[model samples]
Structures are given as C-alpha cells and as structure tokens.
Target: TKPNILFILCDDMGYGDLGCYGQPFIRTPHLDAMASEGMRFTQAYAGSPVSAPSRASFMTGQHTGHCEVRGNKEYWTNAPTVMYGNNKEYAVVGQHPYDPDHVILPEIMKENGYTTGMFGKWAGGYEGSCSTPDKRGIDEYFGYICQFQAHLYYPNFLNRYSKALGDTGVVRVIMDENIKYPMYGADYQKRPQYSADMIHQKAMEWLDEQDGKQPFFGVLTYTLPHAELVQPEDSILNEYKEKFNPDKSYKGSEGSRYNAITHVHAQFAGMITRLDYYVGEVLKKLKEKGLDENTLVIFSSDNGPHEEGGADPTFFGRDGKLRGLKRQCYEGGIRIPFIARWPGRVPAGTVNDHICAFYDLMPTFCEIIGEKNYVKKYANKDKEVDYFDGISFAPTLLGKKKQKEHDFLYWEFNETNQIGVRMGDWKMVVKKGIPFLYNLATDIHEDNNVADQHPEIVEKMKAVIFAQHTPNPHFSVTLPEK
Candidate 1:
C-alpha cells in the first residue's frame, strides 16, 4: 500500500521562527519535536519570496520563470476591463493564469490512486478556470483563492466554501462580543473560528471520515501570521509587546515605528503558536488512527516572512541573521524551513546542509510513490520539458551522496526586478539595476558584490538562467513588453 502523506505548509513563516531554528520568544513545541525526530534541511529555499509563485513552484516542482506567475498579483483574462487603471499589466500579458498542462503533484498523485485533499490557500490560477484546486486534480479542497486579506480571522470577515456542503453553500460571520478578547489575545486560543483553526478542524474531520481503502495525501495551508495584526486577545498581544519592548527611544520619530513593529511581532508570534498547537493536534490524530508509521509528514512554508504585512523584524528576527526579506532573491527572502518525517525510513534527528528548494518536492513525491515511468514520460522530453526545474532529492533523503544533484538552481521575480542563480557555493544576483556576486559558503548574508572581480562566473550564471527562462513547449506565455 502507498504511504499516507500529510503536507503541512505555513504562510510567510520565516526560517528562524521556531525554537529549533533559534527564536527565543516564540514557542513551537510541535515543530521542535518534529525537527528532533525528523530531517531538518539547513539550506532549503522557496521559488519566490511571495506566495503565488512560491506555491506554484511547490505544486509543479518548476522554477518561477517556467511557472509564469512570478509575483503576488491575480491574473485576469479580460485585460482591458481589469487593468490597474493606468494601462499597465501586473506581471504578465493578458491574464497570468497557471498553465493547465503543468502536471501538478496532486494530479500525479491522483492518477497514482491516492485520495488527494487540500485545505488552505490556493493562489495558483484564480477565476473559474485553470486556477481552482478542483480543476488542478485535488479530489477534496477547502480554502481561499486569493490573498490573505480574504482570510481575516474575525467572524465578520470570514468566508468558507466547500463542494460537499451544499449547492449554493453557506456563509457565516462571527458575532460574539465576549469572544473578542481572544481575537486579540496573546494566544488567540479563544478565537477558534480563525481561518487557520477552521482549516485545521476541517482537515482533521476529513481525515477521520476517510476510509482506509487507499493511501491519502492531505495538505493544510495556514494564512495566519501573514497580515493586518488581528490579534486573538489584548492580553497575549500585550505580553509579547512588553517582552520585546518595541517602544524604545529612537533618534527621529522612530519610537512609533518601533512600537508598531513590537505590537505586530507579538501578534504574529501568537498566531504561530496557535498554529503549532493545531499541528500537534493533527499529529496526535494520525498517531491515534495508526497512520503515523507509514505516513510521511512534511512541514514547510510558501516563502520567507514579509514586513509589508505589518511584520516586525527586530523583535523576533524573523529572517534570522540572513539579509533581505520577502520579494527579493536574497537568502533571507527566498530561503525557507523544510522538515520531513517518515517514521523509520528517514533518519531521525538528521540535519542535511546541502542545498534544496521547493521545486524538488514534485519529483521527490513521484519517487516516493514508485512513479518512475511517469517521470520518464512527463518529465523527460527530447528538449527537456521545462515543467520541472528541480531535481529529485529522494536519494539524498535515503542517505545517499553529498555531491550536487542539479547543475544549478534558478529564480526570477520581475515585480522586484530580481533574479538569482545558485551553482555550488557560488551565487549570482541581478537586482534589476544593481548586479552582484557572492560565495554562499563565505557570505551567506550576501554582503559583498564581486561582480567586477568575478566576470567569468557571472557569465556562466547568466547562461543557466537564460536556458531555463526560455518558453515551454506545451504552452505559450510571455512577459509584458516594456
């Protein structure tokens, strides 16, 4: 029988948010336990710093350039009607929808006889066409189709849709005044109706109802800690705020800036802790149902943390010691946490330092399910199908070699005018106007710009980026002409 898969993904969770990674204030006991008992990847990365493209890479195992959605903008077909009122297209020409033929992981798993389900964010295509999760081959799905704004935790702001519920569906808002404190509390525990909590509860209910006929693949994507500081209770918020002391004096009017930063940091931590508790709940259920042994539980984030959504950098150091934040190709922005637990198969408490990225997930899943034929048929074409830009890391997970798997890893984000190419320890960065080079081994924070000193390396990196950036064979989508 195929092994059960539980893929738990968090939104805007930084690399250093958990205790295992080095955060002192936030509490993530469940994640810490998983790290202690599973494999923790040190140099894992996301395809993009923002949600849509990062998730696209995980779904299709291809780089952002090949996926067509490079930033966090919705794609609409009728360009003239939905244009941003300035004759400017957002990321791509016309509608920047996800290509239908990309061969997402769920589609592959569904074909392989696994019951696929997803609960949480699905920011792939949007509209009613190729972007919805149902169209993408997920047998069960529950979540939002757009940004985290639509997922605000307040009852008045929440909206849920499920095909199994009814034809017209149901919409209910939170209307309790006494429960308001938990909504802004340090733990947010009382606000059980929060988007993440609701998704977790639904996922657990679905898991309990599933029959043991075949193995299943379930995903829980949480949008908490992503935006507008809607705390669960004022007490929780005040506790973290006092600990961080974000109101310290500054030279200019920076005191207010620090205060705002501290408040958001505490609130974000509360959301993370709440999500961690729910993760524990899910794990407990798996153990109770006798699915823990064969199940492969994977925990990761869509991308790095963002300061634009009221996130504070100084309080928790969400980006850790790494430089740069969301939207850039820098390490802090794209690098993310990747932890996998597969019971007795994978080494417990193992830490792998080799470079890995989200694009590798699809191929890895294929390898796990013994789908070699499918890989050769869909992934290996005459000219190399641009569908999967990531190489399978399954061998490494099974305690294989330390040598590099792929020649290099590539990324592109047109909105931020950023591009990155990683080959071995050497990395090249092209920040639209400012281009630079650095050896990741020596300078992981990317402080030095050796472009002038390493012209030959720059040329080689540029070639690799150009090769993958070329259009795919099955679909035709181009960047807007400037």
Candidate 2:
C-alpha cells in the first residue's frame, strides 16, 4: 500500500523565518522540531516569486514559463472582500485556470486511489469553472477560490465544494454574509471568523473522518503571516510585543488589498507562530489517528519573504541574507525552505543542498506511490507524454540510490520581467532584458554581476531560458528578450 501525503504550504513565508533556518526573533519551535526529526533542504526553490504562478507550477508539475496561470491574474468573483465585490454566482475567480483537459496534482492522487482534499486558496481556476477544485480532482475543498478573495483574513463567505451530491457536485458555504463587514481596518472583534482558522478547522475536520480504507492526500495551504499584519490578542501576540519592543505599524486597514491590524511586528511574529501551531496541530492529528508512520508530511512555502500589507521582511533579515524580496527573481525571492518528515522512511536530522523546485513535487508524489508514467497513465485523454519540467527527487527522500541530476533549475516571474536559470554552481538572473549573473557558491546574495567575466556561462543560461520560454496564446506575456 502507498503512504498518505500531507502537503503543508504557507503563503509568502520567508526561508529564514524559522528557528531551524536561523531567525532569532520570530519563534517557530514546532517547525524547528520537525526539521530536527526530518530532512531539511537549504537550496529548495519556488515555482515563481509571486503566489498564483508558483502554485500553478507546483500543481501541474510545470514551471511558470509553461503553467496555465502564470501570474496573479484574478478573474472577478464579485464575491465581496474589503477591496472589491459584485456577484453571488458560484464561479471561479482569479487567474486563468487550467484547461478542463489538464491533469493536476490532486487529480493524480485521486486517480491513484487516494482520498484528496485541499483546504486553502485554490487559484488555478474560478468556481463553476472546469478548473475549480471540486472539478480538478479534489474530493473536498474548503477555502478561497479566488486568491484575491484570500487577501482578507475575514471574508464574508468561504467557498465549500464536495463530490457528495447526486450530480457534478454541490456548492455550499461554511461561512455566510451575516458576518460580513468592511474587509480592512475593521474592528477585529466585528469580523467574527478568521479565514485561516476556518480553513484549518475544516482541514482537521476532514482528517477526523478519514480512518481510512484509502490513502489520503491532504494539502493544507494556509494563507498565514502573509500580511495585513494581524493577530488576535492572545499570549502569542503579547509575548511578541513584550519580547520585541517598539513595533512598527502599517496603516493598510481601509484601502489596501490586505486587511490591517495593530502592533505590526508583534502581529507578524504571532501570525508565524500561529502557522507553526497549525503545523503542530496537524502532526498531532495524524498521531491521534495512528497514521504517523505511514504519513509523509511535507512543509514548504509558496515563495520568498514578502513586503506586503503591513508586514516587514527585513526586520530580522527575515528571508535570510538574500538580496531581493517577493516578485524578484533573485535567490531571496524564489529560494524557499523545504522540509519533509516521514518517520522510519526518511532519514532524521538530515540536510539536502540539492537544487530542487516546486514543479518537481507532482512527479515526486507520483514516484512516492511507486507509479511510473503517471501523467501519461492518468491523463489518458492527452497521453502523449507531455514533457513536464520536473525530475523527481524521491531517491533522496527515501534514502535510496543516487539521485539523478537536473541540467538546470528555471524560474520565470511574469510581472518583474525576469527569468532565472540555476545550473551547477552558477546562477543567471535576467531582469528587464539585462542579464546579471552570479556564482551562487560565492555570492549567495546575488550582489555581483559576473556576466562580463563569463560570457560563455551567460550564453548557456540564455539557451536554457529560451528553451523554457514557450508562450501561452490566450494570455500572452511579452517577455523581454535577453
């Protein structure tokens, strides 16, 4: 039998925000403990610097250059948030979704005899669209269909979809309009439900019902510590306030996309601690169900540290000493923290410096289940062996034979007009059509552009970038030539 997968992803979390990763200010004891008991990767990378494209790449096993939703292209839901609102129709909102024919991560799990559930932001497609979670192979989904809708921690309503209906499925609401108020800057007391809390609650609830005839693939994509810099007045918040004196305040409560809260530094710390708490609770739940041994739990972030909402990334060198923040192609923007803990299977207290990316996960999951030709096997409709830009790193995970190497790791951020290629010890970042090369082994911060010194490496990186530059017609992004 195959092992169950619990993929936990945090939105806009920095690589250095954890105790294990070297942040001394914000505490993340649970995650640090997990790292001590699991394998941690120092050179892991995200799909993109921003949210949507990174998630798209993770789900489809394709890089941002090839995935459907390349960036944060939100389709209107008319679903009321503090920023915007309009309609009540059950439809997918946010960026362009995967084609109805496209096979995704959860669907692959579903096909492989796993009970699939996703509790978080599903940005691939809009509700009622063929790309919606319920339609995209999720047996159950509870979260924001629109990534924009996810911006506010307190939304008027959260979308819920299930396959339990007699037909194509049914849509319901875990939350409703009664609790609706102005999204941002509202009195925290007025907004009765915190979206992250509800989402986590739903995830744990789903887990409780699974004693299991079948293996499960549970993805808890928490929109935590992402900004609006908010935290409930609890011991965690108070502790941070006490520990870190003279906090900063970001006044984005009324007009911005992210809602606001008081005590910016304290709230930021509290939110991250809260995310750590979520991870601890999840592990506890797996134990309560006696599924710890057979469950492969993964922890990762969507992208690098962000300077969004009312939050700050540089307060404590949050994303390490990396050069750039979210949306940039620098190592600071795309490099991420990836940790996996599967007791008795993966080696404990280990570290991997392998250059891996988010796209590798789909195929990694496939390999985890001992399945080959997964895409071709399950995507019968388009069984032509679509060349996915991911090489499974399962060999490293299971303590098996020598892992195969990738020629290069690639990342393309649509908004920044940037494309980065990582090959061996060198990294090339092309922004606004100018190539800035750095040998990561020597310059991890990407401060020096050694492009003039090594034209040969620059050309090689150019070829790699061009190879992955296949464009989408429906939403054509004019990438500046290198």
Candidate 3:
C-alpha cells in the first residue's frame, strides 16, 4: 500500500529559524519535537534561492538550470485591475505559467491514484491560464493564486478550484469580512480573516474529509512569517511583544503594499510561532484521524531567510551564521532545514547528513509511491523529453545503507546573476560570470574565495554548469565563456 504524503513548505524560513536548528530566541517546540521524532538533514538545499523557481524544481523534478521557471516572473503587472468585493486588484494575477507539456508532481500523484490538494501560494500560473490549479493536478486548492496578491495577509479574496464541487476553473473566493476596511493603513488591522489562518483552516477542513481509503498528497505551502509581518493580535503576538519590549520599528512602504509596523520584531516572531502552532494543529489532526502512522510528513522551506517587509534577518540570526541572505546563491540563501517523519518506517530520533535538494523530492516521492520509472512514463513522445534532475533519498529516510549520492547539486538565479554548484564538500559560486570557490569542510561561511588557488577544481565545476544549463530566453543568467 502507498503511504500518504503531507508536505508543509514554509515561505522565507531559514536554516536556523527553528529551535532544533539552534535558534536561541524563537521557541519552536512543535518543530523541535518533530525533529526529535523524525530524521533531520544537515545538507539539504532548496531548488533555487527564490520562491517560484525553487517550487518549480520540486514540481517538475528539474533544477533551476533546466526548470522552465527560474525566477519570480509575475503576470499581474500589466493586467487589468478588477473588483473583488470593494478591493481592486489585477484580474489576471500570478507568476508565469508552467510548461504545459511537462507533467508536475500533483498530476503525477493523480495518475498514481492519489488525491491531490494544495493550500497556499500557487505561483505556478495565472488565473484563466492553461497551467492553473484545475488545469494542472490539484483537485482541491485555496489560497493566493498570484504570489503578488499574497503580499497582503488579509487579501480581498483567495483563489479556489474544487473538483468535488465540479469547478471547471479557478474562481475567487471573496473575503467577505476583509473588504470592509482599506487594504492598507490602520484600517487593515481591523480585517478579521487573515489569509494564513483561513488557508490553514481550509486545509484542515479538507484533511478532515479524508477517509484514508485512498492515499493523499497534501501540500500545505503556508505563507508565514514572510512579509507585512502582520497577524491577529493574539497571545502569540502579545507574547513576542512582551519579550522584545524595545523592538525596532519599520515605516510601512505604501508603494510596496506593506503597512507601517511597530513592534516589528514581535510581529515577525509571532508569525513564526503562529506557523509553528499551525504545524501543531496539523499533527493533532492527523492523530485524531488515525493517519499518523501511515502518513509520511515532511517539512521544508521554499528558500532561505528573507529581509523583506521590515524583516531583520540579521537580528534573528536567521541565516544560521551562513553567508548571504535571500536572492543570492550563497549557503544562507539556498541551504534550508529539511525534516521527514514516517513512524515505523523511518528510523526515529535520527540525524542524517545526506546532501539533497528540492528537485530530488520528485524522484523521492515517486520512489515512495512505487513509481521508479516516472521519467519514462511521464515524458511526452511528440517533443524532446524534458530533463529530470533528481536522485531518490528514500533509502536514507528508511535507514537503509544504499542511498546514492548526487555528483553535484546545482542552482542558478537569473535575477541575481548567480550560480551555485555543490559537489561533495567543495562549493563553487559564480557571481556575474566570475567563479568563487569554497570548501564547505573548512569554510562553511563562504567568506574565503579560493578560486585562484584551485583553478582546476573551478574549471571542472564551470564545465559542469555549462553542460547542465539549457538556455531559456526569458530567464538568462551570466554564463562564463568556455
């Protein structure tokens, strides 16, 4: 029998945000307990340094070098503004559409007889696009289809598409309670329906309907602790406010849609703790439904810590003392905290140092569902078969000794003009076409550039990068000359 999968992908969370990862201030007791009950990986990396491409890698089983989406390319900029209740926003809002020919994870799961449900930011495609939730593989979805709209926690409305309800396309579920106040300013605080809380509640409602007769793949891509730093004035927020009495304040950027914020530190900490509470609720739900043992629950972040919306990543030591922040190819941007738990199957209270990335999850999930030849099965015959860059780490999770290793993990962000290649303990980061080499064994911070001393190793990685990168006209990075 196939095991159910519940993948909770957090937004803008870093390697050291959790107590299990050595955060001194923020208390993530549920996550720490989760780590103690599961297997934690020390060398896990995201698909890319940003949101969309990183998620694209997990969906298509391809790294940023070969994935269709390599950056956050939004579609709502020039789209016509429309009314959702009284609030006005772009009618066609979302990131660039995914490649229609290449099958994604949810579609693959559907093919394998698994019920697919996704809640949170759907940056994959725009409204009415051919790559939307209904058009893609998600049978049930509720959240911001456009990542741009997600900037406001109490949005005018969230997107929805339910197969059970016979929805042919994604539709807007108006936030009936939110439109009473302005989208920004003090009035915004009066809105009752927080997007994060609503999304979580919807996700739990879906989970409550699961009877366990069929396997399910639940994607809880919560937009927590990201930006705007605003949440309900509850015990979580108050607790943090009391802790950081003299917290820094940030003047909200009206142009950027961020409201003026006081107690910025408290808001950030509260949002994270709120996310932790959501995780606790999910665990409790699974237990109440008697699905804990047969379910394989995995938690990770889309990318590294972000310094957006008045967020001070430095103050919280969000980077885990690694170099660089979000949007860069440095360790702090790509390296993330990955935890997996499956009772009776995966060994408990274990920590593994297996080098893996988001792209690897495609193959890993395939292996978990007993589909080893997914590439051969899903590839289109009319056109050239798309590249799939992933190696299964299923063996490592099951405490098996035969886990194969990646020759190297690759990441490229066109917006940053950066490329990162990690081959064993050696890491090479190319910025603006100039390569900088660092050995992770000695320089974990990536402060030292030993490229001059190790020209041979640099050239070797450079050649690998050249060979792996498939030129995408829309997303072009600075490539070194051969």
Choose the strongest candidate by TM-score.
3
Q: How do the residues 1-482 of candidate 3 rate in per-residue lDDT, one tens digit apiece?
A: 68899999999999988889898778898988998999999999999999999989999999888888999887778888887566777778888889999889998899999999999999998887779888788889989888778889988889889988888788888888888888877778888888898899999999999986899999999999788888898888889889987788877877777778788889988898889899999999999999999999999999899888889888899446788888989999999999888889999889989999988999889998998789889988877657888999999999877889899899999778998999998999888998989988999998899988998898899989988998787898898768
TM-score ranking from best to worst?
3, 2, 1
* lDDT of predicted model 1: 0.69
lDDT of each: 0.69, 0.79, 0.88
Question: Which TM-score value belongs to model 2?
Answer: 0.93
Error of 2 at 75 (Å): 1.3
Model 1 misplacement above 4 A: 75-96, 155-193, 234-242, 246-262, 379-386, 400-404, 471-482
Candidate 2 scores a C-alpha RMSD against the true structure in Å of 2.9
Could you estimate the TM-score for every candidate? 0.82, 0.93, 0.98
- Across 1-482, the per-residue lDDT of candidate 2 in tens digits comes to 78899989999887788889888888888999999999999989989898888888888888876776777775674555332243233343556778666678887777778899889877787655667776778888888777776777766667777665433553546455524455444554466677888789989989998875789998888889776666567798899889977777666645446655567878888999999998999999888889999999999999888777767777868446788888888888998889999999999999998778989998898888887888557553543445478899999987789798899888776677788888999988877778888988888788888888998888888888777877676534444455
Clashing pairs in 2: 74-94, 75-94, 78-87, 91-127, 92-126, 92-127, 93-126, 185-253
Rank candidates, lDDT, best first. 3, 2, 1
Runs of candidate 3 exceeding 4 Å displacement = 84-86
